[PDB]
Amino acid sequence: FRKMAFPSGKVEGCMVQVTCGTTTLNGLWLDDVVYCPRHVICTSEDMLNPNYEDLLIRKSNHNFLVQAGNVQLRVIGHSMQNCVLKLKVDTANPKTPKYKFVRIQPGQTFSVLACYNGSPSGVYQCAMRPNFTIKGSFLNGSCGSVGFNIDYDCVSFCYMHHMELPTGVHAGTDLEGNFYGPFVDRQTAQAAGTDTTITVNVLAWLYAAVINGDRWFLNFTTTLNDFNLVAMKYNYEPLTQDHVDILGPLSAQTGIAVLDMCASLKELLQNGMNGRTILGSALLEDEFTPFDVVRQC
Amino acid sequence: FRKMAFPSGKVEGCMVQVTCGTTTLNGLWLDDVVYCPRHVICTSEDMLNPNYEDLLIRKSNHNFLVQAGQLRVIGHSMQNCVLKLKVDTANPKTPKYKFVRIQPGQTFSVLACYNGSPSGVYQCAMRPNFTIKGSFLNGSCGSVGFNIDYDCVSFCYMHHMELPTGVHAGTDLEGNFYGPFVDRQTAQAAGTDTTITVNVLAWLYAAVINGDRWFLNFTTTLNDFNLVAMKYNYEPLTQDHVDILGPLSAQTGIAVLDMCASLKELLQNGMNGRTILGSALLEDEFTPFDVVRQC
Ligand SMILES: *[C@@H](O)[C@H](C[C@@H]1CC=NC1=O)NC(=O)[C@H](CC(C)C)NC(=O)OC(C)(C)C1CCC(F)(F)CC1
Numbered sequence: 056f057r058k059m060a061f062p063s064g065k066v067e068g069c070m071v072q073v074t075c076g077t078t079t080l081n082g083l084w085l086d087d088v089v090y091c092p093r094h095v096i097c098t099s100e101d102m103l104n105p106n107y108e109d110l111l112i113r114k115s116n117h118n119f120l121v122q123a124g125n126v127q128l129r130v131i132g133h134s135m136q137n138c139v140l141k142l143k144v145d146t147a148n149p150k151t152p153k154y155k156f157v158r159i160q161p162g163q164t165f166s167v168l169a170c171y172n173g174s175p176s177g178v179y180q181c182a183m184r185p186n187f188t189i190k191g192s193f194l195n196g197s198c199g200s201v202g203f204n205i206d207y208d209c210v211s212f213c214y215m216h217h218m219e220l221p222t223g224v225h226a227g228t229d230l231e232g233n234f235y236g237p238f239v240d241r242q243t244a245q246a247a248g249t250d251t252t253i254t255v256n257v258l259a260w261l262y263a264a265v266i267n268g269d270r271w272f273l274n275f276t277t278t279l280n281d282f283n284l285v286a287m288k289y290n291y292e293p294l295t296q297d298h299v300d301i302l303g304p305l306s307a308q309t310g311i312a313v314l315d316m317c318a319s320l321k322e323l324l325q326n327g328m329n330g331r332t333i334l335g336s337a338l339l340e341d342e343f344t345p346f347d348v349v350r351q352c
Numbered sequence: 353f354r355k356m357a358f359p360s361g362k363v364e365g366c367m368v369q370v371t372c373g374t375t376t377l378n379g380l381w382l383d384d385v386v387y388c389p390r391h392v393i394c395t396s397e398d399m400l401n402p403n404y405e406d407l408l409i410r411k412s413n414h415n416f417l418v419q420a421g422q423l424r425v426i427g428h429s430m431q432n433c434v435l436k437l438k439v440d441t442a443n444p445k446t447p448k449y450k451f452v453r454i455q456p457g458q459t460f461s462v463l464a465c466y467n468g469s470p471s472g473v474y475q476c477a478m479r480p481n482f483t484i485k486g487s488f489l490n491g492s493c494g495s496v497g498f499n500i501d502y503d504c505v506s507f508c509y510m511h512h513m514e515l516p517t518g519v520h521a522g523t524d525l526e527g528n529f530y531g532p533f534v535d536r537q538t539a540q541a542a543g544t545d546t547t548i549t550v551n552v553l554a555w556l557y558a559a560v561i562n563g564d565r566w567f568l569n570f571t572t573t574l575n576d577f578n579l580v581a582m583k584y585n586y587e588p589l590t591q592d593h594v595d596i597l598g599p600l601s602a603q604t605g606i607a608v609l610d611m612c613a614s615l616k617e618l619l620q621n622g623m624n625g626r627t628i629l630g631s632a633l634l635e636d637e638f639t640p641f642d643v644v645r646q647c
C-alpha cells in the first residue's frame with residue numbers, strides 16, 4: 056500500500072562527516088574503519104578527469120578530518136579500494152550494528168538514509184533498476200549516503216552514493232567501491248542503458264492491490280511465452296518460472312494464478328488504465344519486490 | 353524527488369510492547385510514562401461498544417505487562433482515548449520531545465510497529481477530513497507519527513483504527529481523536545475528502561525545480577482559480593497560502609497565480625497521459641515546507 060523504508064536508527068549511528076581540504080561528504084563508520092567515496096580527495100578542477108592514485112599519494116592521514124557529531128576522530132591509516140576510501144581510525148564505533156556488505160541484484164530494493172555533513176536528513180525506499188541506476192533524491196553533499204536492508208538485527212549495506220547521471224537518476228557503488236553498472240566517478244556525461252520495467256515487481260504490486268481490495272483490473276488467461284511476447288514489446292523484463300515461484304506466497308495468499316495475473320497485466324499494458332487507478336497510482340509500480348509486499352502484508 | 357520520511361532512530365528507542373490480557377499493542381515510552389491506545393484493555397467482545405471507564409475499573413497495574421525488548425507498572429490513568437502507564441524506570445533513550453496537534457494538510461512520518469518492534473517508516477499527511485492514508489495491519493495500534501525539529505521529536509499521531517474506505521484514524525498524544533471518530537468497532541463516516549491545493553502547488557514547484565516544466569502555460573485571479581477548485585473539491589487558496597509558497601515562488605521566478613493558471617488547465621484538461629515528477633496524478637501530500645527541505 057505505502058512505499059516503506061526500514062527503520063534507520065542502526066545506520067544513523069554509523070554516519071560521520073569526512074573532510075579532505077574543502078570537500079566534505081558523508082562517511083560510514085563501522086568498527087575502526089570509515090568508508091567514503093574516494094572523490095572526497097578531489098578539488099573542483101580534479102573532478103573532470105581525476106587520476107585518483109596520484110591525487111591520494113599527495114594526501115596523508117592527517118589531511119582527513121573525520122567528525123562524529125562534535126567529536127573529531129583521529130585517522131591512523133588509509134587505503135583506496137576501488138572507488139571507496141577506507142580510513143582507519145583509532146576509535147571503534149561504539150554504535151556499530153551487526154552488519155554485512157552485499158552486492159545487490161537489479162530489481163531488488165533497499166532503503167536510503169540520505170545524509171548531509173554526516174547528519175541524517177531523511178529515509179526512503181529505492182530499487183536498483185535493471186540498468187543499474189537508482190531513482191533517488193540526492194543533492195550536493197549527499198555522497199557517502201548509504202543504502203541498506205535490515206535482516207533481523209543485521210544491517211546489510213548495499214549502496215554508497217557517488218554521482219548523478221544525465222537523466223537525473225543516480226549511480227553509486229557497493230561498500231567495496233565497485234560501481235553498480237558501467238559508470239565511473241568522473242564528472243563527464245555517461246550513458247545509462249535503456250531501462251526496463253521489473254515485471255516480477257509489477258506482479259507483486261498487483262497482488263498487493265488484490266490483497267487490499269482493489270480488484271477491477273482482474274479478468275482471460277495466458278501463457279508464459281505469450282506474455283513475454285507482450286512484455287518484450289513494452290520493455291518489460293521477461294518473466295521466468297523462478298519469478299513465478301518467487302510470487303508463490305502471494306499467489307497462495309490470494310488464490311490467483313500468476314499466469315492469470317499476467318493476463319490482466321497484458322490487458323493493462325495493451326489497453327491502459329482507462330483513467331482507473333491501482334492502489335492510488337495511475338501507473339504500474341515496479342519498485343516493490345514480492346518480498347517487500349509480503350513484509351507489508 | 354520522492355516521498356521522504358524523517359530518520360526514525362530517536363523514536364525506535366521509545367517503542368515498547370504493551371499487553372493486557374490477550375491483547376497486545378505498541379506503546380510509547382517517554383520519561384517514566386508509557387502511552388498507548390486504551391483499547392488494549394478490550395477483549396474481542398468489548399470492541400463493538402466498550403464502556404472504557406467500567407472496563408478499566410477492573411484492571412490493576414499488574415494486569416499491564418510492558419516490555420522493552422519487562423518494565424514494572426506503578427500507576428495507570430486514562431486520558432481521553434489513551435492509557436498512561438506510570439512505570440518505575442525512566443526511558444534512558446528519551447529524546448527531546450513535545451506533543452503537538454497537527455493541522456489538516458500537514459505531514460508527518462509514521463514508524464509502523466508490531467509487538468513493540470519497528471518494521472518500517474513512511475510519510476503521511478493529515479487529510480482535510482482528518483484521516484490518514486497509512487499502511488497498518490492488526491497489531492499496529494500505538495504506532496506513532498512525528499516530525500523532527502533539529503534535536504526535538506514532535507509527536508503528533510497515535511494509531512487506533514481503520515475506517516470503511518481503508519483509510520486510518522487515530523489521536524494526538526493526549527488521546528483526542530483527529531476528526532469525528534470514536535474508538536469503537538463500528539462503521540463510521542469520514543467526510544468527503546478534498547485535495548490540499550497548497551500542497552499540489554508546492555509539488556508543481558518541486559517539479560519545475562527538477563526540470564519538469566511541460567505543464568507551464570496564461571494567468572488567473574485568486575477568486576477565479578477558487579471557482580475552479582471548488583468544482584474539483586480542492587481546498588480554496590488564500591493569500592496565507594500564497595505567502596507560504598513564497599520561498600518556492602522566489603526560487604523559481606513563477607508567480608503563484610501563474611502556477612494556479614497551469615493547475616486549472618491540468619484540472620480542466622487532465623494530464624493527457626503525461627507525467628509530473630514521475631506521477632500520473634497530482635500529488636498533494638508534500639507541504640511547501642517539505643518541498644523546501646528536499647531542495
Ligand atoms: C556527492 O559528491 C555528489 C552528489 C551529486 C551532486 C548532484 N546530485 C548528486 O547526486 N557527487 C558528485 O557531484 C559527482 C562527483 C564526481 C567525482 C563523480 N559529480 C556529479 O555527479 O556531477 C554532475 C551532477 C554534474 C553529473 C556528472 C555526471 C553526468 F555528466 F553524467 C551528469 C551530471
Ligand SMILES: *[C@@H](O)[C@H](C[C@@H]1CC=NC1=O)NC(=O)[C@H](CC(C)C)NC(=O)OC(C)(C)C1CCC(F)(F)CC1
Nearest residue numbers: 391488490493512513514515516535536537538539540
Ligand atoms: C490496532 O489495534 C488496530 C489496527 C486496525 C486494524 C486493521 N487495520 C487497522 O488500522 N485497531 C483496531 O482493530 C480497531 C480497534 C477499535 C477499538 C477501534 N478496530 C478496527 O479498526 O476494526 C475494523 C478494522 C474492523 C474497522 C472498524 C471501524 C470501521 F467500521 F469503520 C471500519 C472497520
